[PDB]
Structures are given as structure tokens and as C-alpha cells.
Symmetry: D2
Subunit: 259 residues, 4 copies
Amino acid sequence: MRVLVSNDDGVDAPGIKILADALRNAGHEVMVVAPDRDRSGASNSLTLDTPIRAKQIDMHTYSVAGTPTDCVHLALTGLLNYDPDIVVSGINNTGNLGDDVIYSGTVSAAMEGRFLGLPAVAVSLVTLYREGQQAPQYETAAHAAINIVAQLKTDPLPADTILNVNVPDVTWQQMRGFKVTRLGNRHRSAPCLTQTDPRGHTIYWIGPAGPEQDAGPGTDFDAVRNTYISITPIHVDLTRYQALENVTRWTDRLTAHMD
Amino acid sequence: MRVLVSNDDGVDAPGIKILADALRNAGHEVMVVAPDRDRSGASNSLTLDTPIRAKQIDMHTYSVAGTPTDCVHLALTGLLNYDPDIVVSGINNTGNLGDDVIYSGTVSAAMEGRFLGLPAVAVSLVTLYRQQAPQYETAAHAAINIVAQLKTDPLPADTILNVNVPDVTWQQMRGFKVTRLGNRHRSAPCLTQTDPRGHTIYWIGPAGPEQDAGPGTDFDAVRNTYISITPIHVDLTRYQALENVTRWTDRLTAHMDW
Amino acid sequence: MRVLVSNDDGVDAPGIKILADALRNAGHEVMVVAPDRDRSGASNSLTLDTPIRAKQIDMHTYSVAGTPTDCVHLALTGLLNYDPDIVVSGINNTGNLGDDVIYSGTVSAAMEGRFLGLPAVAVSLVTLYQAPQYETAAHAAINIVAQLKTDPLPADTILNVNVPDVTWQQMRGFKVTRLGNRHRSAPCLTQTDPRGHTIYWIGPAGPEQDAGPGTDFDAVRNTYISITPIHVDLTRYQALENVTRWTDRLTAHMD
Amino acid sequence: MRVLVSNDDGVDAPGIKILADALRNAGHEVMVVAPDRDRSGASNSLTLDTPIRAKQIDMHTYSVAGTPTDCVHLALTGLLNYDPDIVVSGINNTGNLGDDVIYSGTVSAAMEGRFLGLPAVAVSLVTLYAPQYETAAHAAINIVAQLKTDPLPADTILNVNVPDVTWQQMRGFKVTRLGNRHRSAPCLTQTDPRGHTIYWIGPAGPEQDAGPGTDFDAVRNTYISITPIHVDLTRYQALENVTRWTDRLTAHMD
Ligand SMILES: [Cl-]
Ligand SMILES: [Cl-]
Ligand SMILES: [Cl-]
Ligand SMILES: [Cl-]
Ligand SMILES: [Mn+2]
Ligand SMILES: [Mn+2]
Ligand SMILES: [Mn+2]
Ligand SMILES: [Mn+2]
């Protein structure tokens, strides 16, 4: 089939190159449109007050001076002569779990995919802090992504949600299987710490997570801790339909009161 | 009751001062914790890799060098000797409608309130491109009535309210309306032009008539001079989809080896 | 005379208001063009790759979404029908001394005035650690501006001015000075975060600093107003003849 | 000799690797300390209000989450057991000429070297409209060897700009002064795709200062340009005149 690929770490990052290469080896057509540098720490909104620049790198690749949402939007509304079947965003160099999901740049590019009418997937590798060096297993995450893509064709899912995927950092021979999960939480517990800096000013640190967190059986945290790949289905429309009838009766009692 | 107030435009903004003064006039206790300068344009995530400064401005006010989510998190976990009943974020100097809501800084301060166990509301004024002073007093009037009403008749759901107010005098307003989110950028095309030095550039252009802004939407209410109220999710997990995705995932497993 | 006024802290800050009001009361015409928010932390360069927006607040006041150098450039090349005799930038809420002068945003607005042909002045208040003495700094500025009219200096340098944070009654006089140095000795410090990981700080300056008799630091420490004349052209003319003979020898070698 | 190398574009850029390799092959020792990502667009000041993180990549390389001035300052005040003879910053992916020199990130790393008492050089490639990084490196190693066996006084910085061509096409070296181009640049009033008013800063006209003797005219005619610049902004030659002026002022206000 025909695929469109983006990310939030930049067009020159090791994980986006390994992903696109594997997809082509498997027999697919692939075009890449991604940011000119790393965008972590930047806001995810569409750019409306100023114009945007882009340049061709090779016959299949373009570099854009804007957000991950800017990259997917321009690709689908006039930048390319191309009609894709699906959007895939990643492979990210750290995990995207629990309370981190609503503000993730990797997730924002997949969202713009569905808004414009196509199915979409985000993929992330769960790396762990060390001292020296140990090279990350991007090859392991790519093998999972090509099998997910082929299957979405032979047995299609409805088109009103996005899939968020997280992969343990090991060789494939160690993996135990797949599991379907819900979002956990881990920073409701973080109780601030008071200190003094080298020039005499009072400063504050957000605390580390305690044991009273929500990361048990059924959650995304618990699956990856036990060496399984995690898949969570998420909303694309923030409207809460199941609450409309009740809020209307509430608003009626409000207006009768004041006037 | 006891109220906690924040925003995304900054601690010296005209809109946050008018809101706080009105709440105190109606007999409530109020503490303010907000950013040291306008944050519109920055990421909304919590700050974990570095420490944060904060200082006292007057007996009821603190200025913080960090995000709107940083302000609410610190106030509720050790910064204050205070146990609030509810959180209010606003009044923002422009609207927050349709597809703009998921990444709004004003909305992010109310979300952190609910996560840590309290009811929450976001309030914005719908100003228009043009000397005509903004009607902040009109939006503050709507806010005090909503607060006193939640005190008698609370709301059960895992939900928060997003409120938008037309920029007119109170005598000119037509009523309140409950709405769904609309959309206007799915239709927005890409235009090609040339800059002063000869480089090709691209603009995201204005929406066509194939937009979703008719009867029932947030856009249609404020255009016809009504105040809009929309209830929104705080958990992004899609529960209605779990049974079908599990069937799907088991089939995949049986296909592959190892 | 006709004055143009800008700053680094924004059009809504208390020090730019107090400066513009004192100048008008003394009988000058004043236009204000300044950033829409506090700019401390971004590059001082001119904006070339995108277009810029601007909003007229009242009759003699404008708000610009860009840098301090962007404000002064637009004002002199087409935004206004106005012909100024001098540019003044300030009053800043902290000091601008010694090795901090080259990258200061307050100083950058003055620099763009001189590159385009006019005399220029920068003004800062030296706050320590309460309501700042902005009125004391404004009294110094109106007296300096009047004197430049009747008794003029050559316009190929700019004046950098720093004012101690006290009442006029306490001030001792004016003094002409050179730039000092403070960060040269400032050491690297190794500490730990709440997870046990290593982080570095740039620590405070010890007693070995360059801050004695003759410098900008010593003057304000002893309650005098400091004036330092600074370069507008970074070319080192006095080294040109010697560097030329050196380059001649280098070229004979490679050939 | 012992050399310390930094830049403004980041530790992973192609110009900094080609410079370091050419220096080692010429027989010098080299340590590299540079930013974790591209830095154009941020303030050049030292970071004082928060702490800074760093990571050792290999035996001779370090990656720092901060400014080019932060990189050089930490390297010379305790992060390393190393005693360098000179600092070199580059090779930059575009030119650094005329009125753009005071706020250049590439130039700022060289400055912090001199403030702390060593000699220093900045090198940039003049790209127009596969970049000849090798041409620029051959120029830099010849300059470094001459500074040793025939020394200059260390009270200045050398700012070097190299045309983007093959070595065979180069015409020579030339010593120059800074020119100017933006003083002429006019305000242009236009409308956005909604008819709302916007302003552009337009291109330089024929009135610009770019003739014989300037850095602009040398690189346009295929020569390598070298400009000596100030490290101290004090204008010593105006001090006596400004002292008499301030005397006459103080007699007026009594
Ligand atoms: Cl991400
Ligand atoms: Cl907002
Ligand atoms: Cl400043
Ligand atoms: Cl640069
Ligand atoms: Mn990332
Ligand atoms: Mn805002
Ligand atoms: Mn300032
Ligand atoms: Mn650069």
C-alpha cells in the first residue's frame, strides 16, 4: 500500500530512517515529510500568523521549518501529488505512557492524519538511563510496525480512533507477546521539595513518584514492565456525549434562578 | 467557599485582576498563583529536569517562572497552607473554540486541577479584529453565577466545563446554550507564493464553506450572541473500543512466530 | 527637540512610562515604539525570514511583535512620518555593567540608532537583592539630553549610563569610567539532583575580580552615576598594518 | 600543539567533524565540547539562573545542553583535565560578514576564549543561492601552524570567511575592514491571506557600503578574507574629551 511517515525528533534522527527502510523492504511505497530539527519542548499548534519554508532532500524526502502538525497538514492539502492509504509517526527515542500522552509531539502528527480522514498509528521505544553506552534496539520496534500495517489491510478496523504503541528495549528473542491496555497515572503523588541555590535564592523541585501511584494490572505501565508490547485505543474528539443530557437540565435550573 | 485562580497570559494581565476582584466582592476567599510572563507559544508539559523559582507579590498573590500546569501542581502539593474547594482558569484575552481546544494553555491549568481531585472551569472572551475597550466585566458576571450554582448542585462525571463569552454589554446578551465542538481547519488549503528575496513560501489559508460550524456547534452559538457551555473528557482512553481491539490483537499473535 | 524612545522589558513596563512623561513635561516631542512582551532570552538579530505585525495603541504609542532592533529599524525606514534628532533606550529594571554589555538587549536598541546615523544613549537602574527609584534616573536623563543640544559631542560612539538605586539627596556626583570584569574567575560546581544524577552550576565570583579604581563597578558601589563611552565599529584599525605584513609572509610559503 | 574546538550548529553537524579530523592528521591533540542541538535563534549570554547537564560521548568528545559560551566556560574552569594553547570555532554552514558579526553565535565561542586569556579564531563557509568543507579546513591548518612559529600579540580575534569553491580556483588571501548592508533596507507594507496589514524588511539597495577594502568585496572576487576585531568595547581614545564635557555639565546643575 501507500504510506506517509513523520516524527518529532527531526529528519536526521536514527529511528525514522530505520522505520522507512523496513517498510520499503516489505514491498510498500513510502514518502517522508518531517521537521528540520528536534522539537521537544515546543508547542504543538498549527502555524497561522506567518508563512512556512520547505526543501527537497532526495526523491522521497522533504525537510520543513515548522511543527509536526504543520508537516502532515501541508503534505495532505497541496504540497505533494500523492494519495496515501495510512499515516505512521515515529520511532520515538523515549516512551510515551500514561499522563504524558495528551501533550506528546509524536502523538500530535497521528492526530492530524485522522482529522483529515485516514487511519493512523504512533510508535515509541522504552529506553532506560545508564552510565556508559548500549545501542538501542530500533530493529525490534520496526518488525512490530510492519506486521501491524499489513494486518490493518486484511482485516480493517473502524476509523474513529488512533492506536498508541510502546515497545520494550530488548532483542526479539526475549519478547513474551502483545497486550491491550488503558492509560495509567503516576504524578498525582509528587510532593514538592524546598532548596537553596548557589546565589541564595529559594528554589522548588517537583517530587519523584511514590508507591501510591496507579500502575497495576491492566495498565500500560504494568505491561511494559513485564516484557510485553502495549497497545491502547484513544479518542480523537474531546466532546463528552454521555454527559450532554444531564448538563442541559443543570443549565436550565441556572437560568431560572438568576432570571 | 475557597477558590484557587490561575491563567496563561501572566500575573499582570487585565483579565485575571478583574476576575479575582469580582469573586471577593461576592463573599469568597481567593488566592492567585500564575506565570511571570505570557506563555502563549510554549509547550504545556510539567517541568521535571530543572528546579523552579517563585516569589510573593502581595498578601494574596505569587508569580512563577514556569508553565500553567507547574502553577497549579505546586499550589496543591506544598507551596500553600490552603485547602481549596474549586479551580478557575481565565479570563483569556481571545477565544478557545473547536479544534483549538486540545492544545490551549488556559484549558491545561483546569485539567491539572481535576487530576489532583477537585472540580474545575475554564473561561475565555471572544474578541474581534479591528479604540473599543474589551468587556471583561460581562465575563466575570457569568463566572460568579456558575460558581455559586455548583456549590449546591455539583457535577458527578469525570468532566470539566469549557466556557466562551461574546464581547458585548450584559443587556445585549440573548441567553446560555449547551453545545458540541465544531471544526474549521479540515478545509484549510495550502497557498504557494514568493518572498522579497526570491524564495518559495507556503501559507495555511482560510476555510471554505465545507466547514462544520452550523446549528448545535460552539462556533454558531457565539456568532449569534449566546454564551457557549461544552462538557469535555479528562481521560483519553476509548473504553467503547476495547472489546473489538482485543479480538483483533489475538488474531495477530496467532499469525506470527516465536 | 524630537526624541524616539524604545526598551527590552516591553511597552507596558513601569520604567519606560516614567521616562517618556518626564521628557514631555520638559518641553520635547516624544514617540514610543517598543516590544509587545518581555524579550530577555531571545537573539538580538534583525528578523529577515518572516514578516512582522504592529498595533497603534494611542496617538504617540506603538506595540511591535518582534526584537528591540526590529522596533528602531521600522520606525526609521517607513512606519512613521517623523524625523528624530536622537534615540534613548530604557529605563531598565537591573544594571548593565562590564562583561554583560556586549549581549544586553537595552544596549542593542541604541546600537541600531547609530548604524543608521543618529546620536544614541542607554539608561539602567542598579537594583540590589520596596518601590524602585525610577524618578532619580529620569532626572539624570533629562539633564544629559538638554546638554547634548547646546554643547554637542561627535556622533561616532554611544554613552552607556548606570544609576544607583537611592534618593537624589544621597547622590555624590558623576564619574567617567572604563568597563570592568566579573565572570572570568567564576567556577564550575558539581552537585546532585533528586534522583542521584550529576548536574553543574556556574558559581559566584570571588575576590580576584577586576573591579577597583577607574572601573564602572567601583563608581556605583560608592554612590556616583557612571558614564562609559563605547565602540560602534568592531574593526581593530590599530592592528591592520602589522596583520598585513604577517599575511604577506604566510602567502609566500604556500606558493 | 593542544587545541579546543566548539561551534553554533551542534555536535552532530558535518563541518565540525571535518575540521577536527584535519587537525589531528596534521599532528595536534584535539578535544571537542559543543551544543546538543542547532542553536541559531537563542541569546548568546551565559546561563546563571538554572543548572546545566553534560554527557561524555567518547574519549575526546562531550555534548552540552546549553549555549556556545556555556560550552567554552565549563571546559576551561573544571570539567576537564586539559591545558589548551588556542580555541578554534566552526566551520559554520553560512557566511558571517559586516553588520552581522556582533550577534553571531560562532563568533561568541571565540570571544569567551579571549576573556579567559587565550588566543582565538572563527571560520565560516560562504554558501550561495555539496559544500566544499575540505577547502575551508586546508586554510585553517595553515593559519594555526604560522601562529606558533611566528606569533602575534594576543589582544584581538581573527574573523575568517572562505569562498565555496575548489582550491584550484582560489585567487589569494586579503586583509580587510567590516562593511555594511542593512542601513539601506526599506520597510515594505503588504497584506496576508485575509487582507490584514503586515511589514517586511526588504533587500539592500545600490547605496550599501561594499566596495574596495571591505570583507564583502574580497569574497565576491574569490579571495579568502581575514579581519582583526576588538575584544574590549571601551573606546579609550574618547576618554579625555568626555571627561571635559562632564566637567562643564556638573558646573551647570551645581
Ligand atoms: Cl514525543
Ligand atoms: Cl489559551
Ligand atoms: Cl537588558
Ligand atoms: Cl553563526
Ligand atoms: Mn521526541
Ligand atoms: Mn492566552
Ligand atoms: Mn531588561
Ligand atoms: Mn550557525
